[PDB]
């Protein structure tokens, strides 16, 4: 017994947007940075555009539309909203432009300039996003610093919904069949039994914050993924990041409990990081913290952020 999903899938015309430049090139297709100018609205909207490869399998399209299905059914400040799709010879997915790209890349490039206030703020925002996903009974199933985008250094959003699943109101657990999977982010219960929960997302949340507090270090690097299940069973966990007070690290550890019900709830994480965010230098010890500072076309006059463009 679930509510009808009355979200609107918007169909865009190829004429309504112009692609300025190429963010990335993929086997699947090319991702473009461009502007979306809805017809006769006198606004221009920074967008990221996927244009799928000319040779597109019927599986790859059926899979991509699921991602669009999800990204369209979400409305939250800390989740990437999807503006619409374009049904050209190759389908185009259209999302809000996240100029600073991947959060993982961002921490790697800026570690010297990143301060406790930002880190903790990020932890909170991701927790809010994930909490919203729980309200929508959604399980992301692939949360990692690679899948959080940076709109501004002070505003990050969760992304990459390709693996996301929906739970029947009765349904409590998700059972899956073999596919490529992010072993080093996964709950143990997921690796052993292909089981996913809102709580298995918390585990991945744990790993995600750990990525941020190590400035982009690779979890369980040097050890092969085939070994991970046996190692968690032993009780071994990721080490405490150098900048991390026990308070923060405690919290990560809790995400990695084995009794999944013993792990914290995203709403609780929101609360804990939010307390900590108030007094950042008490909870993260970073050299030079007190002094760190963090932050085209001329057609900019009419530009509006997707976040301010509401339908």
């Amino acid at each position: 017994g679930e509510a009808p999903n009355q979200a609107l899938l918007r169909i865009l015309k190829e004429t309504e947007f112009k692609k300025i430049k190429v963010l990335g090139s993929g086997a699947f297709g090319t991702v473009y940075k461009g502007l979306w100018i809805p017809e006769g609205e006198k606004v221009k909207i920074p967008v990221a555009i996927k244009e799928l490869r000319e040779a597109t399998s019927p599986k790859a399209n059926k899979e991509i539309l699921d991602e669009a299905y999800v990204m369209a059914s979400v409305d939250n400040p800390h989740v990437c909203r999807l503006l619409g799709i374009c049904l050209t010879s190759t389908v185009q997915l259209i999302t809000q432009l996240m100029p600073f790209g991947c959060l993982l890349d961002y921490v790697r490039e800026h570690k010297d300039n990143i301060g406790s206030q930002y880190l903790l703020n990020w932890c909170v925002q991701i927790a809010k996003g994930m909490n919203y996903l729980e309200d929508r009974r959604l399980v992301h199933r692939d949360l990692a610093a690679r899948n959080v985008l940076v709109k501004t250094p002070q505003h990050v959003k969760i992304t990459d919904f390709g693996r996301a699943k929906l739970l029947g109101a009765e349904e409590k657990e998700y059972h899956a069949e073999g596919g490529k999977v992010p072993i080093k982010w996964m709950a143990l219960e997921s690796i052993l039994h292909r089981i996913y929960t809102h709580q298995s997302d918390v585990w991945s949340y744990g790993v995600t914050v750990w990525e941020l507090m190590t400035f982009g270090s690779k979890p369980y690097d040097g050890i092969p993924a085939s070994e991970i299940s046996s190692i968690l069973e032993k009780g071994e966990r990721l080490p405490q990041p150098p900048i991390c007070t026990i308070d923060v690290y405690m919290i990560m550890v809790k995400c990695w409990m084995i009794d999944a019900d013993s792990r914290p709830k995203f709403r609780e994480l929101i609360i804990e990081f939010s307390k900590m965010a108030r007094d950042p230098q008490r909870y993260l010890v970073i050299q030079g913290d007190e002094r760190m500072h963090l932050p085209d076309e001329e057609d900019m006059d009419d530009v509006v952020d997707a976040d301010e463009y509401l339908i």
Binding site: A144, R146, G178, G179, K180, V181, P182, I183, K184, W185, R194, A225
Partner: peptide, 9 residues
């Protein structure tokens, strides 16, 4: 990154 995703079967 591709090296993070391992074929589960």
């Amino acid at each position: 990154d591709e090296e993070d995703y391992y074929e589960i079967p």
